[PDB]
């Protein structure tokens, strides 16, 4: 009785915090799309339906999105699969050559500038002894002038190699379900209001994460998951300024984006069994790519976020916005992909307002680059193939990424500027509800029973 | 429409209950512990790390007196300096998480004590079957 005996218990429901790898699983309709044109189907295992997600009660668990892992190895894995999607593809080492470029056939404005150049150059053939003369079109933002006459070259060709993407593979997202191996569990904060740090009483475990589509957007995170009822703002330390501010706003707001130009491609055989695609002729009106959003929706959503900001910055506070300060071309804008072709599209028509403590649209112009260095690699670049026709796409704008300015010296206006920088902000806007825990069985406890012999 | 007893009997469902009622399920936790061009390497070391963990725990039970019983006893009394809690309150008051954070310092003493106690039990049983 009073001689209490210690007894073990194997399989005690209990866990600790840990960090481990994951399990990449999608649906079988990605495998319906055949011949590996979808990336993440070589390694990505097919999912299961009706995944177990059961509630847990009388439970207090502290979460953190900022000291969270699994955004780190996800940022590893996506660039890893990105490089796995290039080793079958083709190099452009024979292409870096002297370019005889000139202005495209257009009524030219002497003061504005056209953004398409007609470049003729020597190129190899199927056979070695035969050289050929071929022309194509390029944007202004990928050639530079070398030195009378005019001769250009590609910008990467002094400093890096270059790889064409295979036109089989697409760049649309598919939902990636992350899962944990046996011996680990994944938790989820089911609370309505959760700024991102501290306890969450409403939690539930899960076996596999929900649908996550991988986007690439330097500002203005697109097609993401949206909040329940309020507009929520999240940060690590709001009084710190250089740390960003994530803004998950409730209602989605539509965007149209297009390039109105009709586009012909042209195959160019580089060598034996090689291929290359280039912008041939442009039929129709030489126009400029752009995007549109609805005026009053943008006004109302900004009213909601200004309503939500003033809890943190004093109730009698003036809040205004500015365009982003500068830096790289792909952080002065938001930078996205549409139909497998990139856009760097000016955002100064949005963040130019002010707010007081009391059928139209918004159009904004874009630019189109072909060669990129996304994630800013050291000698690695990527060509993007020209695609046919006239491209438009419609996306639900989900969140924002902001930065408070360094406002000292007696200021009541606390203006904001949108700046993304790291992609891990975009990713941390998605896995903020989750964390990974390790099961440790074989707990132990006294009770009143002695083993006989 | 699904019933609440099923998600009580689900995996890690009884994490919030008292430990006396959480005793009524261990097999689901035990079962979900086990199993249920470059990437298969990571897959494969995850799987063998899981089974390495499982074999470590099975060996820790195997050197102890109980192998498949999943509910055991022994012959070392509970030191009241470890807990000084009432016997009634521990089974109907606390959860396993806070029990773990209470007894988490008193670790690797009890392990070696179980090893020593049943080693002595092994030599006693050998002596009793040797005299017979």
């Amino acid at each position, epitope marked *: 009785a009073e001689n209490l005996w210690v007894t073990v218990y194997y399989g005690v429901p209990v866990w600790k915090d840990a960090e481990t790898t994951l399990f990449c699983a999608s649906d079988a309709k990605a495998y319906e799309t055949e011949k590996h044109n979808v990336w993440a189907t070589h390694a990505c295992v097919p999912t299961d339906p009706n995944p177990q997600e*059961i*509630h847990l*009660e009388n439970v207090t668990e502290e979460f953190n999105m900022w000291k969270n892992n699994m955004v780190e190895q996800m940022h590893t894995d996506i660039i890893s699969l990105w490089d796995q999607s290039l080793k079958p593809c083709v190099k452009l080492t024979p292409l870096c050559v002297t370019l005889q470029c000139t202005n495209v056939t257009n009524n030219i404005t002497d003061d504005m500038r056209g953004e398409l150049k007609n470049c003729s150059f020597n190129m190899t053939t199927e056979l070695r002894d035969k050289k050929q003369k071929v022309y194509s079109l390029f944007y202004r933002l990928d050639v530079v002038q070398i030195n009378s006459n005019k001769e250009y070259r590609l910008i990467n060709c002094n400093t890096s190699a270059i790889t064409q993407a295979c036109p089989k593979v697409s760049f649309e997202p598919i939902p990636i379900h992350y899962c944990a191996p046996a011996g680990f569990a994944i938790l989820k904060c089911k*609370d309505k209001k959760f700024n991102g740090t501290g306890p969450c009483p409403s939690v539930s475990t899960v076996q596999c994460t929900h649908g996550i589509k991988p986007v690439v957007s330097t500002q203005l995170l697109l097609n993401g998951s949206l909040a329940e009822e309020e507009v929520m703002i999240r940060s690590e330390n709001i009084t710190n300024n250089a740390k960003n501010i994530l803004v998950q706003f409730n209602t989605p707001v539509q965007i149209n984006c297009t390039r109105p130009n009709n586009n012909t491609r042209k195959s160019i055989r580089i060598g034996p069994g090689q291929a290359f695609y280039a912008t041939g002729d442009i039929i129709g009106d030489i126009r400029q790519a752009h995007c549109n959003v609805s005026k009053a929706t943008w006004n109302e959503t900004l009213g909601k976020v200004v309503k939500q900001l003033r809890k943190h910055f004093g109730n009698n506070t003036i809040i205004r916005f500015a365009n982003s300060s500068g830096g790289d071309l792909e952080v002065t804008t938001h930078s996205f992909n549409c139909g497998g072709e990139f856009f760097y599209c000016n955002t100064s028509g949005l963040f130019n307002s002010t707010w007081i403590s009391n059928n139209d649209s918004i159009t904004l112009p874009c630019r189109i680059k072909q060669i990129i260095n996304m994630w800013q690699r050291i000698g690695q670049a990527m060509y993007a193939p020209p695609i046919q026709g006239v491209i438009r796409c419609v996306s639900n704008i989900t969140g924002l990424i902001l930065t408070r300015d360094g406002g000292s010296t007696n200021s009541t206006t606390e203006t904001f500027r949108p700046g993304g920088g790291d992609m891990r902000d975009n990713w941390r806007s998605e896995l903020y509800k989750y964390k990974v825990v390790k099961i440790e069985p074989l707990g132990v406890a006294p009770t009143r029973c002695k083993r006989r012999v | *429409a699904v*019933g609440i007893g099923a*998600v009580f009997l689900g995996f890690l469902g009884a994490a919030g209950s008292t430990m006396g009622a959480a005793s009524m399920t261990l097999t689901v936790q035990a079962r979900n512990l086990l199993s249920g061009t470059v990437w298969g390497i990571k897959q494969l070391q995850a799987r063998v790390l899981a089974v390495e963990r499982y074999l470590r725990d099975q060996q820790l039970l195997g050197i102890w007196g109980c192998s498949g019983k999943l509910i055991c006893c022994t012959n070392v009394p509970w030191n009241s300096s470890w807990s000084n809690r009432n016997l009634s309150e521990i089974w109907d008051n606390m959860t396993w998480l806070q029990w773990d954070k209470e007894i988490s310092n008193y670790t690797q003493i009890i392990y070696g004590l179980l090893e020593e106690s049943q080693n002595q039990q092994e030599k006693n049983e050998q002596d009793l079957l040797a005299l017979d």
Partner: antibody
Amino acid sequence: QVQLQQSGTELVWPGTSVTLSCKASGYTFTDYEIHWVKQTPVHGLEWIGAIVPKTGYTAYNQKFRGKAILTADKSSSTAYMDLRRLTSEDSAVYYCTRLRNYWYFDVWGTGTTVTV
Amino acid sequence: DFLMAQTPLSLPVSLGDQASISCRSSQSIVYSDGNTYLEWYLQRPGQSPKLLIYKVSNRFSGVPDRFSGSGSGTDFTLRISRVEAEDLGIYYCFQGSHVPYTFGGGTKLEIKR
């Protein structure tokens, strides 16, 4: 016969506490899971919580967290819902109802209006 | 959490005509046993909610074959072959697959002239 004999209609003050009863009638109490359904005119129906009759295992909606407390009597076969520190939104119709696991609600009680 | 958007939220329709309610979930509310535990209720104004449809293809024991249900994954459809004065009340799509359970908005059945 098979009926959820509920409590009486309660007309209470703000901030008080009250207990709503639900006697199982005509069947085996100790196996059929008891649920509680809030009925306001503004929201319609809401899930309050649930209690296992045999073990007393409860689970509550996040809205009702600390607002409602479920007990059960195996002797009198009667579920009890303690409602504490009442506000005017508690002025509603509370339905006692029962199921078995992986099945539906068959029996529906009277529906007790509690007006704060 | 697994919320239910019930369209419509009130059904005025004459007697003898069919009825169709599309209740759409946020995502898959299927439990691990494969069954999509959606339930449809009828609370008359002044009476308790009598169950119409559980286990969407199935019907309540006693509720006639006029009633029926279909729908999967997200998009769910209560169907009635003919609307009666006995059918009147409020209809409910109800996620019965996980705790916390969620009700829909309800659909007040009435008569349109």
